[PDB]
């Protein structure tokens, strides 16, 4: 550590390089706390001269996406894989916008979906609650981030939070496509009759939209969903 | 591992108002000090090794503004800060010296250069010298006058308790005391040596391994600057002491410097600690900044085996070197000890020796393993009798030596025996010098030092505004004062226009507004432009870039070639 820090004019670039090679041979090796301890020790942010940023993880992302092929038929998975899949979505969204990479994103999302997966999901939700509680702007969400939110649709709380902003984006002309996707998702998800769905329906009921096409489409979708379920 | 090829030149310029005294030259003491720094760098630049020199500036101001050029401040910033120093404070020599040493020791704990509790490594050095330029005027505070120099202890640095002095092994303090009179001194320009000054800074200078210079003539100034340029060396100050009877003298005690030569200095054996390590001590004993090294004037034999890694450090000229080269015994050596380094012995076992060179031109310190007269025969017999195939008696004797062998030498000894060709001689285990509590404390100190270094380095910019106010007494409200940053935007602000200049300037701004048709709508001409800093006044090299290039066709200086 002292050699890496003091001799920063010629630092060792193999620290990040060795991660890609080792992860493709021994997946359990990446779960050790030594790398975590090193990252925590080196995480002191200095403004004048320091390497306080994270290097490109394209090789790591490729390895993670290719590991889904070997875990397609595996029903039981460890919590380390779930944590890695959760952490993968928190990147820069390099391949989120690419439509050809839809299969890889779907596989990554399904990987996190269960002996230890419940605890991993609970920990992921607790960690993400810090960002969830923040009142982020609707315009701050990029177009490529829609797939990330839609993929993790298992949690009813996330769906309820997404549906809660349907009335907020009703007056926004730039969110008409998301509003239509929200209506489609609300119609499709109206099959459990749970608390979250009822809350979303009550929130969206009192919102009046000036255009008639969107309201008519929402009413038609609601009628179709009601005809689909006998518990309507 | 550690860059000793980039020396730090910290300048502690006295900015007390007493430095406004005028010499016979017509310039102030502060002007002489700035010229002395400039001359020092002009002389230093003649040496090709001068590249990579870190120049730092600390003053007698308060800690937020004491540091003008610290770490990660470029040369142009150093020059600009030096040029604009003003002598308007009190002679807070002790406080400013404390801040200077804290600045030098800012990153020591982050990078572990001190090697606390693990032996003192002469090759773990960040060689710096503090050249403090001052006058002999008495030290002052708000309360009164201090007749003696005392470095404050309040607000201790994290881990400052580990070394019982503020200055460090690889740091030397030099004082340039200006005693230039206001009258043209009748003394001739005698070529004698520079006197030691008698001010309160001289004891601290001598303790650090430096010296004070008394200056009362420009010729003397040049002489001290030349000697100071000659004293910029990469090395560590060793407190050499005499043990035993003679074989109260200058060579009995000396704070001499041993040279360390890079190429990235390479070395193996540390200087022993002043205590025996144990795994149950909650706290590490404090260190002397200069290790008390004791030699015995016995003229022993300098035993060496062929393949051993031995560190050789050339002593600087000193009365001890004079004594050794005058007795003229280059084939014999004086054994060297560190007191209390052993389990029980007060004097301890030897770790090295002073051996004069063959030409009797220099004396070199040969840093050997701990208790080397016992180890070296065994280490030779390891490779001479059984070819690194240890016997029962040899292993028993080696373990017995290990009982007297401090654990902090285990790493260097392991590396040494490995590079001889016997890697499996000893158990590959962590050094038992430090307890878990000690190592946890050291890591906590490293983190705290990192945070404090980040705070201090970001604080050197002096990004604050002086209290431009006159606190009005009753018998809150204050009267403002002019500032440097309130450049009058007389076109953009009608309050900056004097009454006497009201009409013509009104005409000017009217013309600037209406006549801007196919023109330019700038601020006030003759102010925002044509009041450029003098440094950028005639920068034609930079100016020509903003102009389109032309068409191709094929005593020192006077503003051009």
From Swiss-Prot, chain A:
It is found in: Nucleus; Nucleus membrane. It comes from the Eukaryota. It is linked to Neurodevelopmental disorder with cataracts, poor growth, and dysmorphic facies: An autosomal recessive neurodevelopmental disorder characterized by severe global developmental delay with motor impairment, cognitive delays, absent or severely limited speech, dysmorphic features, hypotonia and cataracts. Component of the Integrator complex, composed of core subunits INTS1, INTS2, INTS3, INTS4, INTS5, INTS6, INTS7, INTS8, INTS9/RC74, INTS10, INTS11/CPSF3L, INTS12, INTS13, INTS14 and INTS15. The core complex associates with protein phosphatase 2A subunits PPP2CA and PPP2R1A, to form the Integrator-PP2A (INTAC) complex. Interacts with ESRRB, ESRRB is not a core component of the Integrator complex and this association is a bridge for the interaction with the multiprotein complex Integrator; attracts the transcriptional machinery. Component of the integrator complex, a multiprotein complex that terminates RNA polymerase II (Pol II) transcription in the promoter-proximal region of genes. Belongs to the Integrator subunit 1 family. This is Integrator complex subunit 1. It comes from Homo sapiens (Human). The gene is INTS1. The chain holds residues 146 to 437 of 2190 of the full protein.
From Swiss-Prot, chain B:
One of its GO terms (biological process) is snRNA 3'-end processing. Induction: Frequently down-regulated in nonsmall cell lung carcinomas and prostate cancers. Down-regulation in prostate cancer is due to CpG hypermethylation of its promoter. However, some involvement in cancer is unclear. Transmembrane segments: none annotated. A motif (Inhibitory loop) lies at residues 555-561. Residues 8-232 form the VWFA domain. Widely expressed. Expressed in heart, brain, placenta, lung, liver, skeletal muscle, kidney and pancreas. It comes from the Eukaryota. The inhibitory loop acts as a regulator of protein phosphatase 2A (PP2A) activity: Asp-558 and Glu-559 residues mimic phosphoserine and phosphothreonine residues and bind to the PP2A catalytic subunit PPP2CA active site to block substrate-binding. Component of the Integrator complex, composed of core subunits INTS1, INTS2, INTS3, INTS4, INTS5, INTS6, INTS7, INTS8, INTS9/RC74, INTS10, INTS11/CPSF3L, INTS12, INTS13, INTS14 and INTS15. The core complex associates with protein phosphatase 2A subunits PPP2CA and PPP2R1A, to form the Integrator-PP2A (INTAC) complex. Component of the integrator complex, a multiprotein complex that terminates RNA polymerase II (Pol II) transcription in the promoter-proximal region of genes. Belongs to the Integrator subunit 6 family. This is Integrator complex subunit 6. It comes from Homo sapiens.
């Amino acid at each position: 550590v002292k050699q890496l820090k003091v001799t920063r004019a010629k630092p060792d670039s193999t620290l990040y390089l060795s991660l890609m090679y080792l992860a493709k041979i021994k997946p359990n090796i990446f779960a050790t706390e030594g790398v975590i301890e090193a990252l925590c020790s080196l995480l002191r942010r200095d403004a004048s001269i320091n390497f306080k940023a994270k290097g490109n993880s394209l090789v790591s992302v490729l390895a993670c996406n290719l590991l889904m092929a070997a875990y397609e038929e595996d029903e039981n998975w460890p919590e380390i894989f779930v944590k890695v899949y959760i952490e993968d979505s928190l990147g820069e969204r390099i391949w989120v916008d690419s439509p050809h990479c839809k299969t890889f994103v779907d596989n990554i999302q399904t990987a996190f979906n269960e002996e230890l997966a419940e605890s991993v999901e609970e920990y992921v939700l607790d960690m993400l609650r810090d960002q969830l509680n923040r009142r982020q702007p609707i315009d701050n969400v990029s177009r490529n981030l829609l797939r990330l939110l839609t993929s993790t649709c298992g949690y009813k709380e996330v769906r309820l939070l997404a549906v809660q902003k349907l009335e907020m984006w009703l007056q926004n002309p730039k969110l008409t496509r998301p509003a239509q996707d929200l209506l489609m998702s609300v119609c499709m998800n109206c099959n459990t009759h749970g608390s979250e769905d009822m809350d979303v329906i009550s929130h969206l009921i009192k919102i009046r939209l000036k255009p008639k096409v969107l309201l008519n489409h929402f009413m038609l979708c609601i009628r179709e969903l009601l005809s689909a379920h006998k518990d309507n | 591992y550690f860059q000793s090829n980039m020396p730090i030149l910290l300048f502690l310029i006295d900015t007390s108002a007493s430095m406004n005294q005028r010499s016979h030259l017509g310039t102030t003491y502060l002007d002489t000090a700035k010229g002395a720094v400039e001359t020092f760098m002009k002389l230093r630049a003649r040496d090709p090794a001068s590249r990579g020199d870190r120049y730092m500036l600390v003053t007698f101001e308060e800690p937020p503004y004491a540091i003008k050029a610290g770490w990660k401040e470029n040369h142009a910033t150093f020059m600009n800060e030096l040029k604009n120093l003003q002598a308007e404070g009190l002679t807070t020599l002790g406080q400013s010296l404390r801040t200077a040493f804290d600045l030098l020791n800012l990153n020591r704990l982050v990078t572990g250069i001190d090697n606390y509790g693990q032996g003192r490594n002469p090759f773990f050095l960040e060689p710096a010298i503090i050249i403090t330029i001052t006058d002999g005027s008495k030290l002052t505070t708000t309360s009164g006058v201090q007749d003696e120099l005392h470095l404050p202890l309040n607000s201790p640095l994290p881990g400052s308790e580990l070394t019982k002095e503020p200055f460090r092994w690889d740091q030397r303090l030099f004082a340039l005391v200006l005693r230039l009179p206001g009258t043209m001194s009748v003394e001739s320009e005698q070529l004698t040596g520079v006197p030691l000054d008698d001010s309160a800074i001289t004891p601290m200078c001598e303790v650090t391994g430096g010296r004070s210079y008394s200056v009362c003539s420009p010729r003397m100034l040049n002489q001290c600057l030349e000697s100071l340029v000659q004293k910029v060396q990469s090395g560590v100050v060793i407190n050499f002491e005499k043990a035993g009877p003679d074989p109260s003298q200058p060579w009995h005690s000396c704070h001499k410097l041993i040279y360390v030569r890079p190429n990235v200095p390479i070395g193996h054996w540390p200087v022993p600690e002043s205590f025996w390590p144990d795994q149950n001590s909650p706290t590490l004993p404090p260190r002397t900044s200069h290790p008390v090294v004791k030699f015995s004037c016995t003229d022993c034999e300098p035993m060496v085996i062929d393949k051993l890694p031995f560190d050789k450090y050339e002593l600087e000229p000193s009365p001890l070197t004079q004594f050794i080269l005058e007795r003229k015994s280059p084939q014999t050596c004086w054994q060297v000890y560190v007191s209390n380094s052993a389990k029980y012995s007060e004097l301890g076992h030897p770790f090295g020796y002073l051996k004069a060179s063959t030409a009797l031109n220099c004396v070199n310190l040969f840093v050997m393993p701990y208790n080397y007269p016992v180890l070296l025969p065994l280490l030779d017999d390891l490779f001479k009798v059984h070819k690194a195939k240890p016997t029962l008696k040899w292993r028993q004797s080696f373990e017995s030596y290990l009982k007297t062998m401090p654990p902090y030498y285990l790493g260097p000894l392991k590396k040494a025996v490995r590079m001889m060709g016997a890697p499996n001689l000893i158990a590959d285990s962590m050094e038992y010098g430090l307890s878990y509590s000690v190592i946890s404390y050291l890591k906590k100190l490293s983190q705290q030092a990192k945070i404090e270094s980040d705070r201090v380095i970001g604080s050197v910019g002096k990004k604050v505004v002086q209290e431009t106010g006159i606190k009005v007494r009753s018998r809150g409200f204050q009267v403002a004062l002019l500032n440097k940053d309130l450049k009058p935007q007389t076109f953009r602000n009608a309050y900056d226009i004097p009454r006497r200049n009201l009409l013509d300037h009104l005409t000017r701004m009217r013309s600037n507004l209406l006549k801007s048709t196919r023109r330019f709508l700038k601020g006030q001409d003759e102010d925002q432009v044509h009041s450029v800093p003098i440094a950028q006044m005639g920068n034609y090299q930079e100016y020509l870039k903003q102009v389109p290039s032309p068409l191709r066709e094929l005593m020192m200086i006077d503003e051009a070639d």
